[PDB]
Symmetry: C2
Subunit: 776 residues, 2 copies
């Protein structure tokens, strides 16, 4: 065991931005590195397009454009596509539009560098930038030190991906909800044991395609290889139906002179084989394909002396999965996919042996607190977030780091507002059935019979969960998983520790956030940091089916290795660093189980059989390319449009599914421009008012107008035209699913932005603002 790839599970997100470094983003390699970075640009800016274009004009190009200046003394086919290329840009825009751009002309450098900036901006201005994953080779003894290439050396990467969504089964709910278990850190045994949200059978997608041989056509697949000796980008292009027919760019791969692999996801293109086939279900739409992928990442290290090292075992190779865009990269889900890895290796009954530092509980409070930028309930209707604000008000947040009895009542009062993932609170038992006596989320199919009045308060967080299908199930609502609830209970009781330097940076939640951020930034294990950073931005519940990945991730059986190694820093755990790897079929795309299924339906019975590794069903956990994403919604845009609010008869709080990555209520740019200026500004327009009006009002009034604007939150689904625009527009749920296929790329993108002088307004120095063309 000499060489390994990191991260073990890379993540790349689709976007219509181009697959180049200056105009793309990178999956986090350090947790919490940029939470307050107010210079982030997650959409392609005009500035980036200009500086991209100027570089292409460096510098021979003007030399040889004046060497063309003389021999015009329009253009022509031959001098068109000589200027073309020189400026290396048909890898960005089709050569034809590049040519009819100048074909149409009449300082000569500027109208070239001007007509072409117009075609670039039409294609890419405001585009959702792609988030690409960097994969690194590390040396072992156990990783320490990246790989360093010497002259005669070479790394060769290989990647095999597939999309099996159109081949796989309907997503009704998580099958593990009825799977017998002793309980894990991620799921209590009470859910299955007491049948709180029974798993449902699921029929095949595209059921009119029959026989396994013909269903292979429903699977899109591609592969490619790149080396250190050539940084040329290789597309990963499959076809649907597989080998009429459309090309599907599943991704693009690149390797630099240093041996690091950069993986770009697709352009986010989803389509049906017939235009009239509309995607009206949140998850299961036949006749559709999308360019989501996931696959197997291997490499061969070849040295000067000829000693070749092959990284293909499961303990040394990696995986890659592409996902929808993160529309708020600095807003972290309250429970992440990394948290599910951490909880998967734990037994529910052994949680009394878990030990807690305050850095283990801080992320729940910090994440729930920052939910206020993407969800109204967490801004206006979350008693814990308001209490945190009260503490910050007094520079008193450090009290929560106090493990002594003096602070017990304070820690309890918060801990007790949280939903218990045992799902055995706030229930009355029929006869046995567990019926919640708290607020239920009704089905849309109503019965005109009076509801039973709730007798118990609604616990936190205010999000739906895997059992949403069953009114009165405690599992309709999301609970932080058992092992983090355990951390929170230990904290409430006082059975936790913390260092003095943490107390000294804990006057407000934000002060302690950047302290913990610097701990990550100065942690020495870059390999495991990069493994965690790839999953810490992903959701880890609820799963219906989720946004990026779904419930097989919460089980240890999907990992060939999952071990705790270290605290983030010697004294500060911060939920720890782990070495984990997925079970992989070493044959990949050529595996005999690449096209396995369970017949006409999948059911929990099949998952039960798949536990035994000797079974005909154990292949479920040995991933072949396409296995991680096949469960998700097809196309993903309908699933995202369905991943929003679920309204109750009671107006407040408004339940939201996954707002950290698919926001529900945002602060538009238009509002930001109406509160970012101080009354002192020397502009003709101040916060949307004339200079005269803005400076003529009392300072009291000026600041009140600022906070009124700051408080106006917009439905994220209203940030582009999703079917509600226009006289007598129907709007509604279903038109959202349909229009998201085209409008996902115009949805608002949340980004940190500064407020230079908030004065006494109450607006924080760092706000997170949603940018879209509609809301500007």
């Amino acid at each position: 065991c000499q060489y390994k790839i990191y991260p073990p599970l890379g993540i790349a997100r689709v976007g219509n931005g181009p697959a180049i470094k200056p105009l793309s983003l990178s999956t986090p390699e350090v947790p919490w590195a940029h939470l307050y970075d107010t210079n982030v640009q997650y959409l392609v800016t005009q500035q980036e397009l200009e500086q991209l274009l100027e570089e292409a004009f460096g510098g021979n190009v003007i030399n040889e454009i004046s060497q063309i200046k003389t021999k015009l003394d329009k253009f022509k086919q031959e001098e068109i596509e000589t200027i073309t290329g020189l400026l290396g840009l048909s890898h960005l825009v089709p050569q034809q539009q590049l040519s009819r751009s100048l074909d149409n002309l009449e300082d000569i450098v500027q109208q070239i560098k001007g007509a072409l900036l117009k075609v670039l901006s039409d294609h890419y201005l405001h585009a959702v930038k792609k988030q690409a994953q960097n994969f690194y080779i590390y040396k072992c003894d156990n990783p320490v030190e990246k790989l360093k290439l010497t002259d005669g050396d070479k790394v060769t990467w290989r990647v095999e991906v597939a999309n099996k969504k159109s081949f796989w089964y309907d997503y009704n709910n998580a099958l593990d909800l009825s799977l017998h278990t002793q309980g894990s850190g991620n799921l209590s045994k009470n859910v299955s044991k007491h049948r709180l949200a029974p798993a449902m059978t699921a029929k095949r997608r595209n059921p009119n395609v029959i026989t396994n041989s013909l269903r292979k056509q429903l699977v899109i697949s591609s592969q490619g290889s790149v080396s250190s000796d050539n940084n040329t980008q290789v597309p990963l292009r499959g076809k649907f139906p597989a080998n009429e027919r459309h090309n599907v760019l599943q991704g693009s791969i690149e390797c630099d002179n240093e041996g690091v692999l950069r993986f770009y996801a697709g352009n986010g293109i989803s389509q049906a084989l017939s235009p009239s086939s509309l995607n009206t279900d949140f998850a299961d739409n036949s006749n559709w394909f999308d360019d989501i992928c996931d696959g197997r990442v291997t490499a061969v290290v070849e040295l000067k002396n000829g000693d070749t090292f092959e990284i293909q075992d499961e303990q040394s190779s990696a995986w890659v999965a592409t996902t929808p865009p993160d529309y708020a990269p600095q807003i972290e889900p309250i429970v992440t996919m990394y948290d599910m890895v951490s909880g998967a290796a734990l037994k529910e009954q052994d949680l009394d042996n878990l030990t807690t530092q305050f850095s283990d509980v801080f992320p729940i409070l910090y994440r729930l607190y920052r939910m206020q930028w993407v969800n109204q309930a967490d801004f206006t209707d979350n008693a814990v977030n308001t209490q945190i604000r009260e503490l910050n008000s007094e520079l008193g947040f450090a009290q929560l780091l106090d493990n002594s009895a003096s602070a017990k009542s304070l820690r309890e009062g918060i801990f007790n507002q949280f939903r218990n993932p045992l799902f055995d609170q706030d229930i009355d038992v029929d006869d046995n059935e567990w019926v919640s006596n708290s607020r239920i989320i009704p089905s849309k199919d109503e019965t005109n019979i009076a509801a039973k009045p709730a007798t118990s308060s609604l616990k936190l967080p205010f999000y739906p969960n895997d059992g949403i299908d069953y009114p009165g199930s405690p599992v309709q609502w999301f609970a932080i998983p058992p092992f983090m609830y355990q951390h929170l209970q230990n904290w409430a009781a006082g059975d936790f520790s913390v260092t003095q330097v943490e107390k000294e940076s804990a006057n407000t939640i934000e002060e302690l956030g950047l302290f913990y951020s610097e701990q990550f930034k100065n942690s020495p294990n870059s390999a495991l940091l990069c493994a965690r950073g790839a999953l810490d931005a992903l959701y880890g519940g609820g799963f219906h089916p989720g946004v990026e990945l779904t419930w097989p991730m919460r089980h240890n059986l999907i990992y060939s290795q999952n071990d705790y190694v270290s605290s983030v820093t010697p004294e500060i755990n911060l939920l720890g660093l782990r070495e984990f790897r997925l079970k992989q079929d070493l044959q990949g795309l050529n595996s005999p189980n690449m096209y396995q299924d369970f017949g006409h339906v999948i059911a929990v019975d099949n998952v039960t059989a798949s536990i035994d590794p000797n079974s005909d069903a154990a292949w479920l956990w040995r991933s072949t390319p396409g296995d991680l994403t096949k469960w998700m919604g097809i196309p993903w845009q309908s699933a995202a449009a369905s991943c929003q609010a679920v309204y109750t008869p009671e107006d407040f709080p408004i339940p939201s599914w996954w707002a950290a990555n698919l926001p529900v209520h945002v602060l538009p740019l238009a509002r930001y421009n109406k509160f970012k200026d101080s009354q002192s500004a020397d502009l003709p327009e101040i916060n949307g008012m004339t200079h005269s009006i803005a400076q003529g009002m009392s300072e009291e009034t000026f600041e009140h107008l600022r906070l009124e604007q700051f408080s106006q939150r917009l439905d994220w689904l209203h940030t582009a035209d999703l079917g509600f625009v226009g006289y007598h527009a129907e709007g509604g749920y279903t038109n959202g699913l349909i229009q998201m296929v085209s409008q996902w790329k115009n949805m608002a993108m949340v980004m940190a932005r500064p407020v230079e002088n908030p004065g006494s307004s109450g607006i924080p120095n760092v706000v997170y603002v949603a940018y879209s063309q509609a809301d500007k």
Copy 2:
């Protein structure tokens, strides 16, 4: 000879399949692609009708679903 079929049923205009909705609006939408598969009426012979009452020249609708 006496069995006449709805011309709209000579191709798949949205009424085919378990729980197909069918209906007026699906016919408008599907005709965009299915106009080219609708039945085509053409004169055809019956060489010896005998005393059946079938004329020697009939007009027959041809499509692929049609047989």
